[PDB]
Amino acid sequence: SVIAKQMTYKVYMSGTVNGHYFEVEGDGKGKPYEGEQTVKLTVTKGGPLPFAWDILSPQLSIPFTKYPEDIPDYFKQSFPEGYTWERSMNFEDGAVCTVSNDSSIQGNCFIYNVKISGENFPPNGPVMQKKTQGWEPSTERLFARDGMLIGNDYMALKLEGGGHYLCEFKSTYKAKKPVRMPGRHEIDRKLDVTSHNRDYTSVEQCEIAIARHSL
């Protein structure tokens, strides 16, 4: 059984955001059939981050997504060779990020190598000012195309004082071997920073993630 009921993973992250260089390693764990995972992160390099932890949160694992038996789990199918992806984040104030990832595996452990580039975060905006307060639960609209999966999600980052700081997610997931596509579907997600030290050089997060059909 290529994907067990309970698994771990390791995540390796680096990138640059408004000029600042950093790296982040995390140990993670969940039950891929439940859609549940937590992960613990250290900022190995460039800590303390001068920007909000949150723009990193979601580049820190799709296989822990609960799919119903009647939709083709593209993510799990792709193993053990696994898969890769690219994503961009376009924020309401012209700040952008781009992200790519390689996801493979090693027995009961996934290995994720992710890279992040980001800029045009206004210096007294909420990303550089650290005034965000997490992501709102969301829903990703996925559809098949040339054996890739396409992804769209309109995300909102909560602000200090009750605002919201909007952001488009466009993502392309690509299997390393070809696999049985599903058709249009959506992933309901919640994702939270459950704990962190004071300058956010250790940080832990939890995610729940569930698939179902579109309308």
Side-chain angles (χ1 to χ4, degrees):
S1 196
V2 200
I3 287 145
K5 264 197 180 52
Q6 157 77 29
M7 288 180 82
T8 67
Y9 72 84
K10 189 82 206 187
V11 42
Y12 294 108
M13 162 165 310
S14 53
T16 313
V17 155
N18 274 39
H20 191 91
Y21 182 68
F22 66 91
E23 323 177 332
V24 154
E25 315 204 332
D27 295 298
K29 58 153 162 194
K31 328 188 180 275
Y33 296 104
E34 292 347 308
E36 301 171 350
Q37 49 181 316
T38 44
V39 63
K40 324 202 197 180
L41 289 329
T42 314
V43 187
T44 68
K45 224 222 155 146
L49 297 186
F51 61 104
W53 176 270
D54 293 321
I55 68 192
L56 317 173
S57 292
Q59 348 302 339
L60 276 181
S61 79
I62 341 298
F64 302 79
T65 303
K66 162 185 234 161
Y67 269 82
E69 282 176 339
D70 67 284
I71 356 195
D73 193 327
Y74 191 76
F75 294 107
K76 303 213 194 27
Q77 269 171 62
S78 75
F79 283 83
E81 302 84 330
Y83 68 94
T84 82
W85 56 262
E86 301 272 346
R87 161 171 313 128
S88 81
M89 311 211 298
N90 313 290
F91 287 103
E92 78 185 47
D93 57 342
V96 168
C97 292
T98 76
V99 168
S100 69
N101 153 115
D102 174 88
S103 296
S104 49
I105 193 161
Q106 149 87 143
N108 275 2
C109 193
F110 296 102
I111 287 148
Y112 302 135
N113 188 295
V114 33
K115 348 253 198 192
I116 167 105
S117 188
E119 86 238 28
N120 185 39
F121 283 107
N124 317 281
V127 177
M128 303 307 311
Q129 298 291 322
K130 278 156 198 187
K131 296 298 204 217
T132 55
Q133 290 185 348
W135 286 104
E136 293 287 4
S138 77
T139 315
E140 192 193 358
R141 279 153 197 108
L142 300 106
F143 75 95
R145 187 213 290 153
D146 312 312
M148 302 172 325
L149 221 42
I150 313 314
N152 268 276
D153 195 346
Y154 315 99
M155 307 258 295
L157 257 159
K158 292 192 293 281
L159 303 173
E160 172 154 323
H164 280 119
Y165 174 51
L166 301 199
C167 186
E168 179 175 21
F169 270 49
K170 317 175 71 80
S171 292
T172 309
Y173 302 120
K174 196 223 285 282
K176 278 171 175 162
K177 66 170 172 219
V179 283
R180 294 164 315 106
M181 310 317 235
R184 319 193 72 89
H185 64 289
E186 338 213 297
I187 304 188
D188 282 330
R189 282 188 178 101
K190 185 193 208 87
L191 172 58
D192 284 280
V193 174
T194 59
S195 109
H196 71 258
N197 58 354
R198 226 187 83 81
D199 65 29
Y200 286 91
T201 67
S202 332
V203 158
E204 314 191 19
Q205 320 184 323
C206 100
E207 164 172 321
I208 195 267
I210 302 192
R212 37 133 180 116
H213 299 269
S214 273
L215 166 131

